[PDB]
Design an enzyme around this catalytic site. Structure first.
Site, PDB file in Angstrom:
ATOM      1  N   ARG A  29       0.758  -1.251   0.000  1.00 51.63           N
ATOM      2  CA  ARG A  29       0.000   0.000   0.000  1.00 51.63           C
ATOM      3  C   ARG A  29       0.786   1.297   0.000  1.00 51.63           C
ATOM      4  NH1 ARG A  29      -4.755  -0.592   2.452  1.00 51.63           N
ATOM      5  NH2 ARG A  29      -5.673  -2.699   2.432  1.00 51.63           N
ATOM      6  N   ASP A  45      -4.284   5.709  12.067  1.00 51.17           N
ATOM      7  CA  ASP A  45      -5.437   4.809  12.082  1.00 51.17           C
ATOM      8  C   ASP A  45      -5.074   3.523  12.821  1.00 51.17           C
ATOM      9  OD1 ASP A  45      -5.131   3.400   8.688  1.00 51.17           O
ATOM     10  OD2 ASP A  45      -3.697   3.606  10.340  1.00 51.17           O
ATOM     11  N   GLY A  85      -7.866  -1.245   0.703  1.00 58.49           N
ATOM     12  CA  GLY A  85      -8.365  -2.574   1.009  1.00 58.49           C
ATOM     13  C   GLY A  85      -9.764  -2.798   0.476  1.00 58.49           C
TER      14      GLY A  85
END
Ligand SMILES: [Ca+2]
Ligand SMILES: [Ca+2]
Ligand SMILES: [Ca+2]
Ligand SMILES: [Ca+2]
Ligand SMILES: [Ca+2]
Ligand SMILES: [Ca+2]
Lengths: 779, 779
Positions: free
Chosen positions: B333, B470, B688
């Site tokens: 990512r 996060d 995701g």
């Protein structure tokens, strides 16, 4: 080739052609708000911390220096537009005439194009954390003209890393809002009403505005052709998220010969924008602010002025080098067009050295940096290589320690007290970075003792650069330079202890110095080549010998052997003769020769660097001034001046095609003879070269030195100099020094008279406000 | 408004207008060399590590996406020039016609302008660590044309931070040298002959070349108007230091209708450039390489193909979403136009979730990532939030632990084994990140036990986002989502232990699951609003209640309560009805509502985020697929499809003016109803959402699920669907599934026949290579 000239009368460097081969920058600000601005208005501003409080963005190391602080002008009758700075619009130089005047803490931009004369002065006023854009537009044509003005700045997300990456977070971390003549920028995650808000305001009441970068610039356009400017009006954008800008627009109607004046203000903190846009509506307040900036430097420059046969020396010492040196002391070394992220705060050895240069002009900032450094020192005695002074404003191990950092602080502290007379400073209690506290005096002894402990079996100080970081690690290897530096620091401390009557310490450190001298004279001299070696590998192999094929002669070891006072006159002259013969070039002195071409980790990372570059055979500027000092101690003023003239940027004003960098600023290094770009200067402004150059010329060539008990005048100048004059302010009194050289010697004082009376030795500090005539006759 | 369309026949997205409001990107590479390229050829390449092995530079978050991999064409008779990609030259769209076809692991660029047709295909061939630029130039005019071609790439200093800052070091860290048709770029400080060298080569023998960026682009010019291109010839520059580029030029004379073909190659490693420029001189080798890339995805796509009444679903599932999902699994990512530095390696929860999506198409990479994650898990049971798999390829405390990371791994491992049948995987010994080792099975139990331990006094899992990261910290606060996730992981593990005959573990974890369900049903249900709360503050205050003014309904807790199988059908339907009523929008489901407007650290950082943005009221895509799964478990196929259609990028092909981002890619989040840009999609590709969307549609809407003992088919579709067909490859056998819905229901299997024979339950794995007809009748 040249792109400008020095204006001695106005203390400004005038750029007459903006197509310079590189950005020539200047520094705005004297307190906390700083702007690094180029002659093309490219650059950025930050507040206190360049790393965590950048105000406007900067895309570095590109063909254009953007974004910047731009003012776009547009003829609303034709739709034609241009910027006051040449870039970003870049109007043809065959059509528009541009001029940029970089001054001390201000820059003036001028553009004369198709009947419109425009001037823009950018400067950070004392007392405010903002930058004023003083704009003047004059209609020099024979018809009525309608001209619109647009400002532009791209607001930073504050953390440099947030501007460069992590946009998944930063793109949603700020917002803009609009109030009459004020774009308010909110760093949403920073709740401080001061530091968490920026703004761009205008003294005029805007016709339109834009807070969104993408709306002002437009799709598939950039600073060279903003959509808003092309169409003649902003989109009145303001919202949360994405990239923000500060654009305020106003249309003006000008009769032939009519001129208007207004200002934009870029700043920090809620409430300040609305206040300043109103305050500066009275242009007299802008003029008053500018006058304060002129006064700021007039006061500083006046404390040391020289009139000599060398115009280049006079021009630089009387303004530019003092300016560059103090800039380093005030703003440190991490905010330029080269240093744009990562390292921030203070470099221990950098500031320790910088702080020795201008205590006569800015004692308060000099004292502040010295206290910062003392607070950044650990009980063991060494200093933290890189740290943020705010951390200790009311820690690494020996593996990351650089063996020389702490030693530079000693001569600097002694000089600070000599200059100010604040002898009580030595008794001040300052906490160590790793806990505990001690007096300044004891902090000093801790540094001296550390170097006495970290030596090899022959008595030479440990220190060698293993990795790419310019740090003399203690993991094996001895450094001649560190031992010489230790000796110098010891001599300084001995004089201090003697002055303070600390007999016990005088004996202790005199003995320590004696051992250092014996060890260096016994092990570091190469009697085949006639010079001092650079040091020894961890395995005991001497580096810098006449028998080696690479890296035979080193500038640092040889100059410091003399500067420190360790080397005899005989070895000193021969070592420096080797420096001249093997390292001198028309561009300055090479760091070493021949360059290394074989990787050898026992010697260091220098063997893995390109030849003629950085540490490996380049002309590293920093140590050049040490050579000047060395030559003055040897009494060879002509040799010293040959070196000074070769490195002096001033003398390279008309060889920009080769130098590239600013002719008013010293640089970190110039490509050496072994690189195809030999002569190209790299990294202006933030280099210790400026502080050392200033110190070397004022204290050794001109020979004016403040002392604990008096002022000394013992010059070493070219034999053909008939003499020179210096105005020196010391401890509240003025000394008008006149040096006469009737017998045309280089060094040696025959007589000194104070106010008409002959004296022997240093000049005792006179009464506050007194003006004293000092006549020095060489012979 | 639209800028292109989906070409189903060629599995490409065709961009017919290059002035898209944002860069629409694609990923080249399937092994180690990767390129993130836009429709304007802007972008960059990296090798293995985007952070430490970037190959070409990228100036992010600017109005232009530069630099890139450009080919400039010049008419040597007129001096006119243009690029094959629209930008950087940006020839008028009224004069030149551009087309870009983004395909799976390749991008085709086309330009038809003033009599010259040019095509450029960029793709990274399997087996090489390089990018091929397959160029074709055709003279479509009626006269002889003389056209020159120039390539351009700006070489990276390899470390992203070195490109963005620390230029005092990086500007002297590399050099270029030239050999026939090959610019060799040497990262001087990287001695590895492979990783420390890059190159740009050409199959043709060059007429000129440029290795120095400043010489190719020229002073005060950029990629839009290179001096070399304007003058029609490079300066044959090559040297050490400063910024380097890869520009090779060749002039061609073309008769009317004549076309030529040649290639440029950007790559890594000494020796490879000279080899490949020669290899590709035979264009058949280029075609063969391209054919291998087509085969690579043909093989993968064929393993799951669907034919349904929903064209948008078919188009995405049969190609684009599979592609996006596998891209995440392969490249992670941290390399896009948004992720451009800092974070690198693998995000634990990100990859743990991504890896559940394509084990049917790429089991080898899925297994690799699973092993990476197991190696990145500590003995305590939790996983390292962010780590580099290379670190453990032959550590933080509980304060930096995010309570959900490790749990996602359980369902993923179970799915991997179900898919491949590699039951022996559970016995494999894998070392923990902090020392020691255990079987995969035990690694799993360590994760399950950790969450059972870290709960509050009421039995709910600890976890709450305090800072901007996060991460569900364990420093106080309970999370409904984590407890539901724990239950889901437990159900998965229980089925596994049951399959493996581990009776003891079956009892242990069944009991653990029972306690989790009781605690959640007792404390997390809000009977006034009819939904599940988000969690509780450290002080015990429930967050997400019908009585609160802000943040009443939360998507994650409510969808997972159902997806996990914890919630009853009754509470599930009511909770999801609240989700539909309060969170649904034409753009997808909002994360929560109403948005928070009052900072409350007891609740979390979400209360300090802009309304309608990111975690605070935006349409966070990731959890949307969970809502689809929830609805299928409730048997409401029409509701599930309403949600799918709203988020499906395909259906937004003609609303780009609002969406902005690629209509073929899921994004991290879309601005919510509370933000003025509601509808704008942010951060395509690396989310995701793609893996979960693929998993949700294939396994729950279409209902095809591999199992430990058989293949299950239990669809939940819109009642009006007459049926659908799926081709599924599982464990070496093919299953041709036909679903019939004569009674028009949404869920419920009346019968299933295998090869004409009725069966009850799952389809047993058939023989290798067998082709099986499966008819499922709903009723
Ligand atoms: Ca703020
Ligand atoms: Ca005390
Ligand atoms: Ca006076
Ligand atoms: Ca290399
Ligand atoms: Ca073992
Ligand atoms: Ca078959």
């Amino acid at each position: 080739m040249k792109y400008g000239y020095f204006d001695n009368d106005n203390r400004e460097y005038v750029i007459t052609r903006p197509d310079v081969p590189a950005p020539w920058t200047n520094y705005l600000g004297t307190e906390k708000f700083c702007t690094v601005i180029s002659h093309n208005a490219g650059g950025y501003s930050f507040y206190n911390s360049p790393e965590y409080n950048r105000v406007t963005k900067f895309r570095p190391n590109a063909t254009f220096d953007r974004p910047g602080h731009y003012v776009y002008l547009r003829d609303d009758d034709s739709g034609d537009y241009w910027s006051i700075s040449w870039q970003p619009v870049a109007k043809s130089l065959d059509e528009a005439q541009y001029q940029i005047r970089h001054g001390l803490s201000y820059s003036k931009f001028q553009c004369d194009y198709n009947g419109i004369h425009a001037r823009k002065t950018l400067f950070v006023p004392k007392g405010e954390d903002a930058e004023i854009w003083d704009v003047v537009i004059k209609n020099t044509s024979d018809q009525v003209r309608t001209i619109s003005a647009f400002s532009f700045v791209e607001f930073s997300f504050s953390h440099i890393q947030s501007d460069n990456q992590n946009h998944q977070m930063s793109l949603y971390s700020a917002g803009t809002a609009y109030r009459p003549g004020l774009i308010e920028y909110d760093l949403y995650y920073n709740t401080d009403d001061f530091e968490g808000f920026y703004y761009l305001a205008s003294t005029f009441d805007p016709d339109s505005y834009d807070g969104q970068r993408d709306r002002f610039l437009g799709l598939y356009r950039d600073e060279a052709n903003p959509l808003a400017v092309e169409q003649g009006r902003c989109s009145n954008s303001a919202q949360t998220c994405y990239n923000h800008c500060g654009s305020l627009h106003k249309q003006f109607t000008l009769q032939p010969g009519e001129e208007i004046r207004f200002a934009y203000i870029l700043g920090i903190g809620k409430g300040n924008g609305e206040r300043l846009r109103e305050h500066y509506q009275d242009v007299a307040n802008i003029d008053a602010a500018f006058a304060a900036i002129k006064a700021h430097w007039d006061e500083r420059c006046a404390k040391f002025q020289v009139k000599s046969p060398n115009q280049g020396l006079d021009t630089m010492i009387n303004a530019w080098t003092l300016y560059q040196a103090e800039t380093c002391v005030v703003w440190s070394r991490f905010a330029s067009f080269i240093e744009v992220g990562g390292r921030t705060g203070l470099g221990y050895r950098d500031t320790a050295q910088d702080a020795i240069s201008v205590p006569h002009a800015n004692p308060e900032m000099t004292r502040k940096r010295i206290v910062d450094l003392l607070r950044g020192q650990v009980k063991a005695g060494y200093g933290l290589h890189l740290f943020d002074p705010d951390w200790f404003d009311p820690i690494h191990g020996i593996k990351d320690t650089c063996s020389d950092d702490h030693l530079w602080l000693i001569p600097t502290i002694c000089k600070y007290v000599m200059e100010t007379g604040e002898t009580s400073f030595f008794d001040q209690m300052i906490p160590y970075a790793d806990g505990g506290e001690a007096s300044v005096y004891e902090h000093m002894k801790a540094a001296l003792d550390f170097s006495a402990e970290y030596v090899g079996q022959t008595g030479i100080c440990k220190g060698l650069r293993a990795d790419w970081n310019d740090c003399l690690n203690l993991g094996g290897g001895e450094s001649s330079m560190v031992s010489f530096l230790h000796f110098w620091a010891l001599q300084e401390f001995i004089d201090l202890a003697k002055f303070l009557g600390k007999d016990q310490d005088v004996n202790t450190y005199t003995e320590m110095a004696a051992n250092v001298r014996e060890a260096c004279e016994t092990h570091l001299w190469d009697d085949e080549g006639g010079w001092y070696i650079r040091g020894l590998t961890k395995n005991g192999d001497k580096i810098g010998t006449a028998q080696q094929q690479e890296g035979r002669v080193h500038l640092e070891s040889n100059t410091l052997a003399v500067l420190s006072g360790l080397a005899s006159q005989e070895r000193g002259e021969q070592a420096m003769d080797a420096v001249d013969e093997h390292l001198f070039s028309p561009y300055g002195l090479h760091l070493n020769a021949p360059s290394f071409s074989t990787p050898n980790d026992d010697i260091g990372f220098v063997t893995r660097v390109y030849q003629g570059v950085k540490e490996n055979g380049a002309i590293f500027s920093h140590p050049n001034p040490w050579a000047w000092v060395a030559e003055t101690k040897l009494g060879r003023g002509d040799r010293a001046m040959k070196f000074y003239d070769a490195l002096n940027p001033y003398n390279q004003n008309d060889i920009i095609e080769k130098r590239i960098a600013e002719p008013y600023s010293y640089v970190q290094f110039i490509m050496g003879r072994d690189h195809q770009d030999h002569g190209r200067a790299n990294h202006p402004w933030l280099t210790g070269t400026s502080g050392w150059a200033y110190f070397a010329v004022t204290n050794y060539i001109l020979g004016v030195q403040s002392g604990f008990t008096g002022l000394s005048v013992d010059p070493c100048i070219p034999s053909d100099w008939p003499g020179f004059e210096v105005t020196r302010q010391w401890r509240g009194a003025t000394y008008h020094i006149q040096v006469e050289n009737p017998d045309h010697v280089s060094k040696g004082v025959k007589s000194i008279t104070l106010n008409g009376a002959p004296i022997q030795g240093r000049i005792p500090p006179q009464a506050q406000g007194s003006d004293n005539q000092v006549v020095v006759v060489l012979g």
